[PDB]
Amino acid sequence: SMEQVAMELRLTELTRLLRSVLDQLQDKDPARIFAQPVSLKEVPDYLDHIKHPMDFATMRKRLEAQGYKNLHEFEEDFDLIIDNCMKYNARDTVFYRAAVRLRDQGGVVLRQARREVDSIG
Template structure:
């Protein structure tokens, strides 16, 4: 009886791992498309540096950028699209928190970035459903 259980667990583990890999592949395509649209994304490609905005970290408590998101995708830290979207939304939250009263042109770019993210996630919804489904226990 034990002999049968080990392969079943192994198969389930392999299926979950395959789902994680597939999810990461899809999310990497999405983040790459966001990064390539530099008219919208150019300000959000890398972390904000203290030398560029000395008071940024007094206002923004959870910094986020597309480079960090890409790194998290590659490390397979996202277990679903909701967590990925949350980080993209954090870029918009931060842009509003820091720039609403300073640089009024920046928050709308972050809003466009989030809108584009939502569109891309919707375009890949079927594949994302499959990948996330393969990860269920």
């Protein structure tokens, strides 16, 4: 149908916008602390602590499968990255501090993307 195509074009554009948003969020992690999943070889007990792991590579895979339907779902995953880290690592750690900085710096980027997604529909 012609509607299903029109939808598919919107999803594609949302995917295009969320791709730029992801690139901007990931620039705020220059140390690449959140680039890849926490290693289960190197942190064997991780899943006893964190029930829903997340990282930028895993968000990228979902993004390119057009698996984000709206900005809310995308933000849930970003928030997992941050909130997982702040629980698993203690306050006086390079890792916790990196998440606080990503949260603060990403907020600005997420603030504008919400307006762009409301604006462009």
